[PDB]
Amino acid sequence: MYYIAIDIGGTQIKSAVIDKQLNMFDYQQISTPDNKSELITDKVYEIVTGYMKQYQLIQPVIGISSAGVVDEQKGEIVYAGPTIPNYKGTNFKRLLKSLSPYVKVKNDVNAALLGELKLHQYQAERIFCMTLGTGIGGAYKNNQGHIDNGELHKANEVGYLLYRPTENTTFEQRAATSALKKRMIAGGFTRSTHVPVLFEAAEEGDDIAKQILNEWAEDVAEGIAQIQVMYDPGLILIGGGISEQGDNLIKYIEPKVAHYLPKDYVYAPIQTTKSKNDAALYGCLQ
Amino acid sequence: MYYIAIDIGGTQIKSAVIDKQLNMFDYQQISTPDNKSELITDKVYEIVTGYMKQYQLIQPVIGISSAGVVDEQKGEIVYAGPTIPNYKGTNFKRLLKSLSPYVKVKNDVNAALLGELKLHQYQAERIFCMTLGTGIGGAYKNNQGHIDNGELHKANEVGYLLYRPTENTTFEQRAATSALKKRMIAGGFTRSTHVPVLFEAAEEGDDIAKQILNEWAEDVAEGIAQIQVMYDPGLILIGGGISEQGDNLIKYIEPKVAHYLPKDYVYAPIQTTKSKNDAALYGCLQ
Numbered sequence: 001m002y003y004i005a006i007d008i009g010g011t012q013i014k015s016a017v018i019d020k021q022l023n024m025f026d027y028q029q030i031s032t033p034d035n036k037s038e039l040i041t042d043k044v045y046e047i048v049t050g051y052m053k054q055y056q057l058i059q060p061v062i063g064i065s066s067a068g069v070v071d072e073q074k075g076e077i078v079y080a081g082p083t084i085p086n087y088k089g090t091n092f093k094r095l096l097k098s099l100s101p102y103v104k105v106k107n108d109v110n111a112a113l114l115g116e117l118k119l120h121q122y123q124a125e126r127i128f129c130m131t132l133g134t135g136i137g138g139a140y141k142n143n144q145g146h147i148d149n150g151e152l153h154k155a156n157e158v159g160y161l162l163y164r165p166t167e168n169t170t171f172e173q174r175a176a177t178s179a180l181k182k183r184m185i186a187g188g189f190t191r192s193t194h195v196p197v198l199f200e201a202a203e204e205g206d207d208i209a210k211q212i213l214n215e216w217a218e219d220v221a222e223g224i225a226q227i228q229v230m231y232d233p234g235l236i237l238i239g240g241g242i243s244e245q246g247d248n249l250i251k252y253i254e255p256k257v258a259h260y261l262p263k264d265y266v267y268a269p270i271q272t273t274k275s276k277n278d279a280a281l282y283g284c285l286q
Numbered sequence: 287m288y289y290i291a292i293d294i295g296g297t298q299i300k301s302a303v304i305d306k307q308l309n310m311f312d313y314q315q316i317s318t319p320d321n322k323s324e325l326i327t328d329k330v331y332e333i334v335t336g337y338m339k340q341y342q343l344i345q346p347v348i349g350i351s352s353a354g355v356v357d358e359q360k361g362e363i364v365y366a367g368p369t370i371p372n373y374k375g376t377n378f379k380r381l382l383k384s385l386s387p388y389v390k391v392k393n394d395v396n397a398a399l400l401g402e403l404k405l406h407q408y409q410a411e412r413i414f415c416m417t418l419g420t421g422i423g424g425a426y427k428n429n430q431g432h433i434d435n436g437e438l439h440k441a442n443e444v445g446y447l448l449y450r451p452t453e454n455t456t457f458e459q460r461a462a463t464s465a466l467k468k469r470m471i472a473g474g475f476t477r478s479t480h481v482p483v484l485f486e487a488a489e490e491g492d493d494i495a496k497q498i499l500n501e502w503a504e505d506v507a508e509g510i511a512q513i514q515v516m517y518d519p520g521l522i523l524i525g526g527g528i529s530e531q532g533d534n535l536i537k538y539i540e541p542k543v544a545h546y547l548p549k550d551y552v553y554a555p556i557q558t559t560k561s562k563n564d565a566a567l568y569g570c571l572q
Contacts, residue, residue, distance in 0.1 A: 126437050138516070143434045150518025151412050151429075152552065160515040162448070163546045170548070229446040230424075230516055232436025260449045262456070268437065 001061070004051050005281040006044060007108065008032070008066040010083050010134065013040070015047045016281050017055060022119075024278065026051065035086050041095050048099055061102045063284035064092045065111035069153050075105035078153055083134070106284050109137035109156075110147050112239060115283030116273050117141060124234025128227055129273065132240040135159045136172040136223070140231055161223050174219040177242045180212075187212045195241070199248050217252035224253065225260035228267045239273040246272050287347075290337050291567040292330060293394065294318065294352040296369045299326075301333050302567050303341060308405070310564065312340070321372045327381050334385055345386045349570035350378045351397035357439050361391035364439055392570050395423035395442070396433050398525065401569030402561050403427055410520025414513055415559065418526035421445045422458040422509075426517060447509050460505040463528045466498075473498040485531055503538035510539070511546035514553045522556045529558040 007014040009032060016027040028047065033040055044064070052060060068080035068087055075094075080087035093103045106114070113129045131137040138156035141147050149155050159172030173179060177195060184198055187208060201209035224236060242249060254270045261267060273279065293300035301314040314333070319326050330350070338346055354366035354373055361379035379389045392400070399415045417423035424444035427433055435441050445458030459465055463481060470484055474494050477487060487495035510522060528535060540556045547553060559565070 124437060126434065142428070144430065144432060146430060148412070148429045151410060151520035151554070152518055154518040155516070157515045157518070160548055160551075161512055163511070165545070225449070226447055226512055227516070229443045230441070230513070232438055232441040232443070234437035259451065262446055265446075266438065 002051075002055050002057060003285050004048055004057075004060050004062045005284055006047055006062070006064050007111070007280040007284065008040060008044070008064065009108065010067055013043055013047070014277075014281060015051075016278070017051055018282065018285065022282065024281070026054065032084070035084055040084070040087070041090060041092075044092065045095065045099075048096060052099065059100045059102065061285070062096060062100055062104070063111075063281075063286075064103065064105045065108050065280035065284035066092075066105065067108050070105055070107040070110075070149075071153050072104075072106055072149060075103055104284065106280075107149070107153075108280050109139045110149065111280035111283035111286075112273075113139040113141060113147065113237075113279075113283065114286040115279035115281065116237065116239070116275055118282055118286060119275055119279075122235060124268070126231065126233040127235045127237060128231050128233040128268075129237040129239050130158060130224065130227070132175070132177045132220070132238065132242050134178050135176050138227070140233070158223060158227065161226050171219075171223045175216065175223055177240060179219075180216045180242070183212055183216055196245065199245050203248065213252050214256075218256050218259070220253050221256035222260050224257050224270070225267070228257065228261065233268050236268045236270045237273050238270065239279075243272040244276060288341050288343060289571050290334055290343070290346050290348045291570055292333060292348070292350050293397070293566045293570065294326065294330070294350065295394070296353055296367075299329060299333070300564075300567055301337075302564075303337055304568065304571065308568065310567070312337070313564075318370070321370060326370070326373070327376060330378065331381065331385075334382060338385065345388065347388045347571070348378075348382060348386055348390070349397075349567075349572075350389065350391045351394050351566040351570035352378075352391065353394050355439050356391055356393040356396075356435075358390075358392055358396075358435060361389055390570065392566075393435070393439075394566050395425040396435070397566035397569035397572075398559075399425040399427055399433070399523075399565075399569065400572040401565030401567065402523065402525075402559050404568055404572055405565075406560055408521055410554070412517060412519040413521045413523060414517055414519045414554075415523040415525055416444060416510070416513070418461070418463050418506075418524065418528050420462060420464050422462050424513070426519070444509060444513065447512055457505075457509045461502065461509055463526060466502050466528070469498055469502050473501070481528055482531075485534055489534070499538050500542075504542050504545070506539050507542035508546050510543050510556065511553075514543065514547065519554050522554050523559050524556065525559040530562070532558050 001020050003018045005016050014029045017025045069078045071078050076091040077087050092105050096103050127141045129139050136159035138158035161171040163170050198209050202213050287306050289304045291302050299316050303311045355364040357364050362377040363373050366373035378391050382389050411429050414426050422445040424442035447457035449456050484495050488499050
């Protein structure tokens, strides 16, 4: 059986066909429209009809992963930031009703975690994933196997942790990847915008790069400590583009989590996600 | 059918028999031994054998609620404070093996929440309870019924939230009841060191009492805001001795949660617990 997977992001819409054996075919990736003159829902419908034509599918199972706050049972966007305008109220089940009655919708961090966990073997039972990007997302897979999305579909909006009144910043406004980029630029990293150059510069011993990274990692670690004492997970995953840095990201963050926890507190191992691109495409089918 | 319920505290050991219709009989209240000359394990064995004789029970169902860190499946004290010396390694299942194979063991905040939830009808699927006392305890009951205790049985240690390096305090060191008593002294409330007199004075219009309460409630609300964006619960209960203040406690805390959340964020209703004494005795059977 062939499955259609679509992952709707702020900047990109990824899609692919997956078979019963999890082989991935016809991976496609386009720019997310402005959702004003050209509609996200039109792109989604074009992708589904495209694959249905190409694979001669009738009533395909379709999985949709999307940014924003998602009501999974309704298959509807409950809320979206102004990043994606006019997005609230978008109902993918209604949109594709003429093509298939088998449409599943998930928010993007939940789908990514479901995919990460389907494709990998982990020792821990309870796994929290924090995704660093424009903002910070969170998802938790619990002792009994499930991801709870909250009473109002707002579980684990961890970017909103640790509001500092004097500075008027949230966790994600200090600790997202976008915040690290702003801190680099203000620190004189002006020729390359790219976050990996900061890590390479630090690896070579450049003190200013190390100081920017450690100060930011300190703010990241503060957020992780809050998640630690609530969830007591067996493993904490860090995802998002910056997670391609692997242990070079972890070594800055992991030792500093201790700074916000009681003396000798044993906290969970911290690692980067392993599947970097496809995770939500697999997860949105689960 | 008769169940034996035992609640082991820092100062008291509560006990009772509960029947099929949740009627409570033969409530007993003794002082916790020093666990040096006379052993807690011996008192529990005595309580269980006493009730078995009196009610002519053979292999009774026994529920045990206890302070400290509890491995519910081993039925074992994983860690205990200095309050109760020598407690770690106590295994109530091994201790009572000769009397019954039906022994359940739970930590005291989890038991109290389960009892609170069995005896009442609430308007929410996901319920967090925060217990204010010497320190602050926490417990969370899920969308799917059960309580996740964490990978090392240390879930929901809300007292460790929000460590501030400059002030060297955790959440509970600012926001627990014992902290309010310290803040009464620091704030100039020379009338009394009793918490109910602080509230009385505030109701009478005392500006110093009002200021101590608002500043303290500000700190309480900061912690509730963190729990809110992680769990997105449908209801937050406040328990502990101070929760006797009912609406007069809630009215200081509830509106301040908004201060640590994004503009127009819709957060859970906040109420005080309803069962004041017996909850863990009911809960340890659940």
